[PDB]
Amino acid sequence: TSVKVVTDKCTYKDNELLTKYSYENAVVTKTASGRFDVTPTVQDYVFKLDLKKPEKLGIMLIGLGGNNGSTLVASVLANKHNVEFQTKEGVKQPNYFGSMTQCSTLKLGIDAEGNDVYAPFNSLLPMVSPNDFVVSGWDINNADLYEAMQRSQVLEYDLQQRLKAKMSLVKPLPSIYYPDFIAANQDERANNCINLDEKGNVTTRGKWTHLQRIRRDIQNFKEENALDKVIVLWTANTERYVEVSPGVNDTMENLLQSIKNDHEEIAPSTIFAAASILEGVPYINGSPQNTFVPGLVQLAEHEGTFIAGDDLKSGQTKLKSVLAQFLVDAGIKPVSIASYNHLGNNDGYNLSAPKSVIDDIIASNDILYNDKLGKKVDHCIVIKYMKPVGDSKVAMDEYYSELMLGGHNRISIHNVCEDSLLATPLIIDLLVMTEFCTRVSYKKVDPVKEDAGKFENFYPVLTFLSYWLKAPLTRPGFHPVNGLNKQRTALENFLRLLIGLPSQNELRFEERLL
Amino acid sequence: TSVKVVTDKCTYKDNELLTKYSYENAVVTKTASGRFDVTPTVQDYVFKLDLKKPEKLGIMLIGLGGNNGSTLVASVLANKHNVEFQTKEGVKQPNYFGSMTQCSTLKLGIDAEGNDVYAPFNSLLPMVSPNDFVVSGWDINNADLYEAMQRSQVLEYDLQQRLKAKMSLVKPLPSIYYPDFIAANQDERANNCINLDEKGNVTTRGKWTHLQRIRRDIQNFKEENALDKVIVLWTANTERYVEVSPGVNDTMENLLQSIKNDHEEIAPSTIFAAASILEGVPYINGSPQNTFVPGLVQLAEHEGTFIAGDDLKSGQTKLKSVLAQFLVDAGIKPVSIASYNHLGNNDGYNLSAPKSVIDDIIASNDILYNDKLGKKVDHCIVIKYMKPVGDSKVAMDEYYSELMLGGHNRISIHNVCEDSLLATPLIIDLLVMTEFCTRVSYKKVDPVKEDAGKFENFYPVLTFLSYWLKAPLTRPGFHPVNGLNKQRTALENFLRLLIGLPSQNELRFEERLL
Amino acid sequence: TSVKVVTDKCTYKDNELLTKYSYENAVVTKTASGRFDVTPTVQDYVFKLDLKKPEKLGIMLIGLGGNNGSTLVASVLANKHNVEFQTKEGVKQPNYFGSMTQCSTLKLGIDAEGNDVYAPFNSLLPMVSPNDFVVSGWDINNADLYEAMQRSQVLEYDLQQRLKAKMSLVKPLPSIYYPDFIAANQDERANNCINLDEKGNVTTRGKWTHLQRIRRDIQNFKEENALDKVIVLWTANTERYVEVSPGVNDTMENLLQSIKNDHEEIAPSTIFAAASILEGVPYINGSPQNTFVPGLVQLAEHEGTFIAGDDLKSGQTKLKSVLAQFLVDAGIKPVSIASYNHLGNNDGYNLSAPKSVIDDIIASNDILYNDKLGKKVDHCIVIKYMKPVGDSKVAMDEYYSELMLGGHNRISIHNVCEDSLLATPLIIDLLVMTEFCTRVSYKKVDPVKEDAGKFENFYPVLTFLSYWLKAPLTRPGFHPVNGLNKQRTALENFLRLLIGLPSQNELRFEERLL
Ligand SMILES: NC(=O)c1ccc[n+]([C@@H]2O[C@H](COP(=O)([O-])OP(=O)(O)OC[C@H]3O[C@@H](n4cnc5c(N)ncnc54)[C@H](O)[C@@H]3O)[C@@H](O)[C@H]2O)c1
Ligand SMILES: NC(=O)c1ccc[n+]([C@@H]2O[C@H](COP(=O)([O-])OP(=O)(O)OC[C@H]3O[C@@H](n4cnc5c(N)ncnc54)[C@H](O)[C@@H]3O)[C@@H](O)[C@H]2O)c1
Numbered sequence A, B, C: 001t002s003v004k005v006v007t008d009k010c011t012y013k014d015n016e017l018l019t020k021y022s023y024e025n026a027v028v029t030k031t032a033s034g035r036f037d038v039t040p041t042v043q044d045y046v047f048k049l050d051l052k053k054p055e056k057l058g059i060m061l062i063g064l065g066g067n068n069g070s071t072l073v074a075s076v077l078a079n080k081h082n083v084e085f086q087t088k089e090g091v092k093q094p095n096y097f098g099s100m101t102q103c104s105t106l107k108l109g110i111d112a113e114g115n116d117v118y119a120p121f122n123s124l125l126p127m128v129s130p131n132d133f134v135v136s137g138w139d140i141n142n143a144d145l146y147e148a149m150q151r152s153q154v155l156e157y158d159l160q161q162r163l164k165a166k167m168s169l170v171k172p173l174p175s176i177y178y179p180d181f182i183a184a185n186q187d188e189r190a191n192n193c194i195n196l197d198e199k200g201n202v203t204t205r206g207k208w209t210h211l212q213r214i215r216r217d218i219q220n221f222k223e224e225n226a227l228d229k230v231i232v233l234w235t236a237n238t239e240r241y242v243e244v245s246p247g248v249n250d251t252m253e254n255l256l257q258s259i260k261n262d263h264e265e266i267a268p269s270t271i272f273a274a275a276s277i278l279e280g281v282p283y284i285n286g287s288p289q290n291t292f293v294p295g296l297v298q299l300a301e302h303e304g305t306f307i308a309g310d311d312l313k314s315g316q317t318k319l320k321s322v323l324a325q326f327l328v329d330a331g332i333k334p335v336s337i338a339s340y341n342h343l344g345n346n347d348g349y350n351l352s353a354p355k356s357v358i359d360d361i362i363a364s365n366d367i368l369y370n371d372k373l374g375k376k377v378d379h380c381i382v383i384k385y386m387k388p389v390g391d392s393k394v395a396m397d398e399y400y401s402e403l404m405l406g407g408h409n410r411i412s413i414h415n416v417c418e419d420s421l422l423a424t425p426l427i428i429d430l431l432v433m434t435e436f437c438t439r440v441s442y443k444k445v446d447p448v449k450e451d452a453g454k455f456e457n458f459y460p461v462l463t464f465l466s467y468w469l470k471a472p473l474t475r476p477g478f479h480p481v482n483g484l485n486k487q488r489t490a491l492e493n494f495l496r497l498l499i500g501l502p503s504q505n506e507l508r509f510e511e512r513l514l
């Protein structure tokens, strides 16, 4: 399945794709008089898409032995080998449900009877299939992917048994472990580390050597498997936030120096990220950690390496975003939002250890939210640990909106699902989109000089992945976009413009006019 | 609060706005080899907006003495005269929360810093304020609008008392009551009928005179209030679906005669609609009735009168269109959708006497729904009647979806609110937007012959209002568009294009690139 | 509406009720072989019930100006003076719904056909009517009760208005305010204190003079009105648990001395209690405070003054107890019970600052809970403050039970209501019952000696009220019962035995046999 657009904006050459595009926008300036001044903005571009996708993509997850890690590898094997499995409801076939890049579709246009015609998200342009993912990684635990899969209690027993043979062969490489960055209760799982002293005890000494190790591990993995492309995705337990101290991790030279001196400010995630950047490998942070300190970000810009991340954005977080937006777009003013969640996996255990979307929506509607009628919105996030629930997550949200004439509206949302079975599919999307973006270059074409300038690459921070990130990383200055649906459309239009197609207008003048 | 855009596509003259716009789309063809051939299409237009908005807008509601009717008149007066009222929470100020046209916002562009900039939905172009609404109408019950509130039990007691003086002076004109079109017999509540024989009893005879009677009321209302524009909206109890037959109510001329012949296939709504069309007055159907039979449609096309409607989109039904779209757009395949509603309005007793979105979503993604994994989605809607709940309706939805590897996701939606407080604000939007389209005319540009033909009005059926309509009617052959968000965006780009602004793309190339 | 029972166990003389009763029970001892040895038990008694109920019961509430305090006085005036009020749903008559003692019924037996016959809970024996309640009390805030209502936002605006005249006449007496005993600082809300130094500021010194003063308040209140009987109920914000030391709290003589020494361990509640006990007036602690320390208890024993309470039981807590017991009573094993609640009352502050029934069920079933299958049950209660909710409280419980053959059951509860409208009704019961027990004296019957012993009143600590207390303090040694239903039956039987009626045994041999 493929798509071909007949447009004079797209041309080929040496197995590549060149396309012109006029980026239209507009700058605004509010007048104290209460008048908006909009001045349209135009900027022609020329995008180059590397039409040669890797025959096999290399994926290295930090926390391979975890729920997502094991589930990911499992999904890849089951799907690639069509490993059907027995279930209480009969024999089921493997699939990537939950993956918008694998099971979603986009509207290309209309047909004869002016009806909308859709095509798979990955049919517009060549993208790497997860079935071609060569997965490996690190993890402070030596349990093979079969054992790791059993303790995760995520997949059917039968499916696990049919994958047992293969899974048992995959062992996660030893990793870096600095106790002062996670739950004090990890000393038992931590039995697969590279940072061990002469005797054999965990040590935060020799961080630079650790970085050297991860670098080598990347190289070896890429060598053992005739691979050219590799992607590092952090899916390990959450680390504690790190202090951004000046003269330590604020600039490039400092960061690397800090590591060499084993500065306390350097977390293991910091080392993994740095090692990935130094190897030209795109690093993706799927955890709530300020891993990308100004130092690393600077190093990324320099090396021209890709970095994206900060929390995988759960499926429930996506709902809260949609619901909230919906209400406010309809003129409904939510006054209170209660979100109480609780699960029982090793993830929610690390959280409970004894030792903003809503904000943007408010600033967008000064009608409902202002000093005269109120500019605040109560919201609380709760996450309790309940082991006797398993990976099955229970999400509960309560929206109390203010309606016309003293009226009120209360919406109760009860979400229940196998937490890992949502994140995994999502992680696949990030991987798929990351490598795709790697094969994309752009040139800011001006009107006065022909062929002026060479092709550049996407800004180090792939904001185009904010759809799968709870805390979208943004370059100094710009404000992150949290509008889920808007992030979804951004992708559509992006893929569209690449094949010579304008933005969706939904004006359907074919029907409304004539 | 106004908006001024700097563009050479907009020129003002004679208090009118002329805007050039290039409409881009694309036809698609599917090849046996599973390939989509996209053929881009372009069509330049020239829209003309009548900047002269009515100083006062005439609104005539059928069933003006009901929940929505009484509540609507209340909101207008409360907001127009700033009638604050006492509540359990204290003194409150009236507003139009729930009204997207009155309390929502739109993105105009970005500011210097690079942040987004929003403006009220009705700030781009001049629109009629509900504060300038002159409401009147018909109803089979003579009770004045004050008594209407008391029995409706929708607004705060205090507010009702502060509006008692004014409300009690508003009385609904006698309406047409064919007991054969309403499930429950209402001859006692119907003490305000026009169709009475010499014995003073209700009869379905002389339907033509009934039609003239209505046309007379439309004429009287317009003169007694010195009004120009007038809009009729149906908010009366649901009628039974009429039958479509050749020579009867299929052709324009057939309908007219079928009326003079007092045919059994002519409902009072059919009459009200026809009368509205015969007066060049736009008619809207806020009820689930095939009132716009092919006869009336053609009737409208001839008269050049705007029509649209068929059931008012409720609040819960919107959450459905949102959630459902959300999931499938995320690659999640829903398989079970069960909705259960129940309230206690007067209409709740009418729906107690017996005589889609999910579809468009299934056809959009053939990856999840095909002849191999399942192309069906069990959906059921059960609306009971619980008088001991007042205007407060309780809705509950249960979405059961299949996840990756035999996974599952169960989402429960519990919505509670005073139904009429959601519909009223919605009705206001229909009226505010309808009168707008009345001041809009376009001209399909001919590349060969300039100034070819003259400005035309929208196709009688205003699908642009399908955002507020549950079962939007369309042109013969065309498929309905229920995507809530897609309908919303349609309105955006429509307003944006009239001021010389391109459709939103959310590409934000100022951050992603450079 | 009284109940006459023909019995040789009940004798009415000199306006008093003498009833005989044989208390049957059983002692048990476990055997090594797992065999249970039950040894029956019997003990004859003779109860004397003072049939002279007060014409007017005196109630003094500590925290009169609070939500419950204001609502209680209001409920009394509304019902007493039949103050009907207007509401969004028409005129409504005042009642005591939520009060089992005032609105529940009991089974007296069968009839001719053999059908169950019920009678109001307060018709078997003479009980005080809340309509005869003369209320007064203390509060650190001087706002009159009318202003108290507006601040509580609990009752309908109209009702508050119709009670404005009478409510404005009620003002709470100055109370004792020790700032170091309240979580949230309240120096701005506190303007009605007695503990003021000569200069005129709040001080914790001179606690004994403070007690003397409160004694005066009780004496005056009693003299002021023609009251002989008076009860004190604490409904003020929660204090901090005062640690118990062997030199101050330990005994009666110490407590009194400690008070004279202004010991930091003497809280204002401690004083109010002592003051109440010293006046022969029963004290009820309606908050989670170890007010009743050993010292106080002993004092109550010496003076023979009744005391009881320790945190008012919530409708939320009551419900959790019912389901919990229900599930276990059906052989179902609940493994996880999550509870999340949030409100916006003033107490929300005292429940937010920088300051089990489940266990009994588990221990009552070694079949479901044991060292072989599991003896634990994850439970957790979360309470959040959400001002934009008013008096309304949103409770959510999540029970995850275990079924057979790997089965599982999930029950999601969602309770919503005005927190104070359920509590107020409960406080009334406590008062009604507390005064009832006051007129109850018993005498143990010695089979070998006639008329042996005198009639003794209930043990200072009233447990028959546990139905309304979450943390019912029990005499040293015994274990507190938390099974709601059982507490209900305890009351049923007690009232029945008093009128000569057997225990309740649903055995219907008049149907099951013969
Ligand atoms: N599952 C979801 O739905 C979801 C949603 C949003 C975010 N996340 C985030 O994704 C991450 C993974 O969650 P999970 O549910 O898979 O947890 P998990 O317990 O199953 O796995 C995390 C793994 O990390 C390993 N690990 C810990 N420290 C490490 C280190 N220094 N180096 C290498 N490995 C290390 C652990 O041994 C463990 O196997 C978390 O950071 C979580 O907050 C998950
Ligand atoms: N109330 C809501 O929130 C809501 C939301 C979505 C859709 N709707 C739709 O709106 C319609 C009615 O809404 P309502 O809330 O106004 O109901 P309603 O019962 O409160 O009032 C309808 C009014 O119309 C009058 N009436 C009945 N037959 C009539 C006739 N032939 N001509 C003139 N008047 C007539 C009735 O006596 C009554 O006063 C229904 O079709 C319903 O499905 C209502």
Ligand SMILES: NC(=O)c1ccc[n+]([C@@H]2O[C@H](COP(=O)([O-])OP(=O)(O)OC[C@H]3O[C@@H](n4cnc5c(N)ncnc54)[C@H](O)[C@@H]3O)[C@@H](O)[C@H]2O)c1
Pocket: C062, C063, C064, C065, C066, C067, C068, C069, C138, C139, C140, C141, C175, C176, C177, C178, C189, C234, C235, C236, C237, C238, C268, C286, C287, C288, C311, C312, C313, C314, C345, C346, C347, C419, C420, C423
């Ligand atoms: N309201 C309920 O539903 C409910 C349910 C269970 C338990 N309780 C218990 O009862 C208490 C009352 O709760 P509320 O909801 O009525 O709070 P509230 O704020 O409405 O009223 C408490 C009142 O106590 C007064 N007060 C505080 N400290 C005092 C002192 N030292 N002496 C005299 N008055 C004092 C306050 O000024 C206030 O008017 C809580 O502390 C709580 O532990 C209440």
